[PDB]
Coordinates of C-alpha atoms in Angstrom, one line a residue:
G1 CA 0.4 -6.4 -62.6
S2 CA -0.5 -9.9 -64.0
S3 CA -0.1 -11.9 -67.2
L4 CA -3.4 -13.6 -67.9
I5 CA -3.3 -14.0 -71.7
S6 CA -0.8 -15.9 -73.9
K7 CA 1.6 -13.6 -75.7
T8 CA 1.4 -15.6 -78.9
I9 CA -2.2 -16.8 -79.0
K10 CA -4.5 -15.5 -81.8
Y11 CA -7.2 -13.6 -79.7
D12 CA -9.5 -10.8 -80.8
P13 CA -11.4 -9.4 -77.7
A14 CA -14.1 -8.0 -79.9
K15 CA -15.3 -11.5 -81.0
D16 CA -13.3 -14.1 -79.1
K17 CA -13.3 -15.5 -75.5
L18 CA -10.8 -17.4 -73.4
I19 CA -10.7 -20.5 -71.3
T20 CA -7.7 -22.0 -69.5
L21 CA -7.9 -25.8 -69.1
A22 CA -5.8 -28.2 -66.9
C23 CA -6.1 -31.9 -67.8
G24 CA -2.6 -33.2 -66.8
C25 CA 0.2 -33.4 -69.3
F26 CA -0.5 -30.5 -71.6
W27 CA 0.7 -32.4 -74.7
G28 CA -2.4 -34.6 -74.3
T29 CA -4.6 -31.6 -73.6
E30 CA -3.6 -29.8 -76.8
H31 CA -3.6 -33.0 -78.9
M32 CA -7.2 -33.9 -77.9
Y33 CA -8.5 -30.4 -78.5
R34 CA -6.7 -30.1 -81.9
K35 CA -7.6 -33.6 -83.0
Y36 CA -11.4 -33.1 -82.5
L37 CA -12.0 -29.3 -82.2
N38 CA -9.2 -27.4 -84.1
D39 CA -11.7 -26.5 -86.9
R40 CA -14.1 -25.0 -84.2
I41 CA -11.6 -22.9 -82.2
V42 CA -9.7 -19.8 -83.1
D43 CA -6.3 -20.8 -81.5
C44 CA -4.8 -22.6 -78.5
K45 CA -1.4 -22.5 -76.7
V46 CA 0.1 -24.7 -73.9
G47 CA 1.5 -23.0 -70.8
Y48 CA 1.7 -22.7 -67.0
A49 CA -1.2 -21.2 -65.0
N50 CA -2.2 -20.3 -61.4
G51 CA 1.1 -20.8 -59.7
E52 CA 3.3 -18.9 -57.2
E53 CA 4.7 -15.6 -58.7
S54 CA 7.6 -15.6 -56.3
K55 CA 8.8 -19.0 -57.7
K56 CA 9.3 -17.8 -61.3
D57 CA 12.8 -18.2 -62.6
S58 CA 12.5 -15.2 -65.0
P59 CA 10.8 -11.8 -64.5
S60 CA 8.2 -12.4 -67.2
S61 CA 7.9 -16.2 -67.6
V62 CA 8.3 -19.6 -65.9
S63 CA 10.2 -22.5 -67.5
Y64 CA 9.4 -26.2 -67.8
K65 CA 12.5 -27.0 -65.8
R66 CA 11.3 -24.8 -62.9
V67 CA 7.7 -26.2 -62.9
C68 CA 9.0 -29.8 -62.9
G69 CA 10.6 -29.0 -59.5
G70 CA 7.1 -29.6 -58.1
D71 CA 6.9 -26.7 -55.7
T72 CA 5.8 -23.7 -57.9
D73 CA 2.1 -24.7 -57.9
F74 CA 1.9 -23.9 -61.6
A75 CA -0.4 -26.1 -63.6
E76 CA 0.2 -27.5 -67.1
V77 CA -2.6 -26.0 -69.1
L78 CA -4.0 -25.3 -72.5
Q79 CA -5.4 -21.8 -73.1
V80 CA -8.1 -21.8 -75.8
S81 CA -9.3 -18.8 -77.8
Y82 CA -12.7 -19.3 -79.3
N83 CA -15.7 -17.6 -80.9
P84 CA -18.9 -18.2 -78.8
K85 CA -21.0 -18.1 -82.0
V86 CA -19.0 -21.1 -83.4
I87 CA -18.6 -23.1 -80.1
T88 CA -20.1 -22.6 -76.6
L89 CA -18.2 -22.8 -73.3
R90 CA -20.4 -25.7 -72.3
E91 CA -19.3 -27.7 -75.4
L92 CA -15.6 -27.0 -74.5
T93 CA -16.2 -28.0 -70.9
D94 CA -18.2 -31.2 -71.8
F95 CA -15.2 -32.1 -74.0
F96 CA -12.9 -31.3 -71.0
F97 CA -14.7 -33.9 -68.8
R98 CA -14.4 -36.5 -71.6
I99 CA -10.7 -36.4 -72.3
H100 CA -9.2 -37.0 -68.8
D101 CA -9.9 -38.5 -65.4
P102 CA -10.9 -35.5 -63.2
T103 CA -11.3 -37.5 -60.0
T104 CA -7.6 -37.7 -59.2
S105 CA -6.1 -35.0 -57.0
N106 CA -2.7 -33.6 -58.2
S107 CA -2.2 -36.4 -60.7
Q108 CA -3.3 -37.7 -64.1
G109 CA -2.5 -41.3 -64.9
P110 CA 1.2 -42.0 -64.2
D111 CA 1.9 -38.2 -64.2
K112 CA 2.2 -37.2 -60.5
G113 CA 2.3 -33.6 -59.1
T114 CA 0.4 -30.4 -58.7
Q115 CA 1.3 -29.4 -62.3
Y116 CA -0.9 -32.3 -63.6
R117 CA -4.0 -31.3 -61.6
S118 CA -7.5 -31.0 -63.1
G119 CA -8.6 -27.3 -63.4
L120 CA -10.9 -24.8 -65.1
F121 CA -9.5 -21.3 -64.9
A122 CA -12.2 -18.6 -65.7
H123 CA -11.4 -15.3 -67.4
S124 CA -14.6 -13.7 -66.1
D125 CA -17.0 -14.1 -63.1
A126 CA -19.8 -15.1 -65.4
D127 CA -17.7 -18.0 -66.8
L128 CA -16.7 -19.0 -63.3
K129 CA -20.4 -19.5 -62.3
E130 CA -21.1 -21.4 -65.5
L131 CA -18.1 -23.7 -65.1
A132 CA -19.1 -24.5 -61.5
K133 CA -22.6 -25.3 -62.8
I134 CA -21.3 -27.6 -65.6
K135 CA -19.0 -29.4 -63.0
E136 CA -22.1 -30.0 -60.8
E137 CA -24.0 -31.5 -63.7
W138 CA -21.1 -33.8 -64.6
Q139 CA -20.7 -35.2 -61.1
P140 CA -22.9 -38.3 -61.4
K141 CA -21.0 -39.4 -64.6
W142 CA -17.7 -39.4 -62.6
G143 CA -19.1 -41.1 -59.4
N144 CA -19.5 -37.7 -57.6
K145 CA -15.7 -37.5 -57.2
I146 CA -14.8 -34.6 -59.5
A147 CA -11.6 -33.0 -58.2
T148 CA -11.4 -30.2 -60.8
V149 CA -10.5 -26.9 -59.2
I150 CA -12.6 -24.0 -60.5
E151 CA -11.1 -20.6 -59.8
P152 CA -10.3 -17.3 -61.6
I153 CA -7.2 -17.1 -63.8
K154 CA -4.4 -15.6 -61.7
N155 CA -1.4 -15.9 -64.1
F156 CA -0.5 -17.5 -67.4
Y157 CA 2.8 -17.9 -69.2
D158 CA 3.4 -19.5 -72.6
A159 CA 5.3 -22.8 -72.5
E160 CA 8.5 -23.2 -74.6
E161 CA 8.1 -23.4 -78.4
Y162 CA 9.0 -27.1 -78.5
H163 CA 6.0 -27.9 -76.1
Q164 CA 3.6 -26.3 -78.6
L165 CA 1.9 -28.9 -80.8
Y166 CA 4.3 -31.5 -79.4
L167 CA 2.3 -34.7 -80.1
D168 CA 1.4 -33.4 -83.6
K169 CA 5.1 -32.6 -84.2
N170 CA 6.2 -35.9 -82.7
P171 CA 3.6 -38.7 -82.8
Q172 CA 6.1 -41.1 -81.2
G173 CA 6.2 -39.0 -78.0
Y174 CA 4.7 -39.9 -74.6
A175 CA 0.9 -40.3 -74.5
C176 CA -1.0 -40.4 -71.2
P177 CA -3.2 -43.6 -71.0
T178 CA -6.1 -41.5 -69.6
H179 CA -6.0 -39.0 -72.5
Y180 CA -8.6 -40.2 -75.0
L181 CA -12.1 -39.2 -76.0
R182 CA -14.7 -41.1 -73.8
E183 CA -18.2 -42.0 -74.9

């Protein structure tokens, strides 16, 4: 089988939908989404998505230590649970393309590696087609160089508790220079 959904995220399949976002260092990804959109989303959790199953260091999870090895292909991500009647997927994706530089391949600012890659991981085929459409429309704003990988969600594992809400727990922690809301 496969773990696609966070074990700790607040998610009601009757009303909510999911989107998994890769913007580089997931501390910045969560901080941006919570700073500007916490009141409009149901819940969000940081984790590791779309990597090699064989390179997990535990049967049901993958650790920060293991991912930092740089060979697991796992991406540092934020999984967002949201109500479509409160906020649309387009609004969340527009925000996505404003909070990081999506033109760099396997890097975000000084953070280098496949774990920091730009990505949009869809939890349905319908979302996949919409995400690809939104990426197309955003191209001219980023010099037609958008490197964001759009593919279905393959696996997701919650990051360690200390990673959750990191920059809101510790404001003195590392902040990526590219992680800010652009005009």
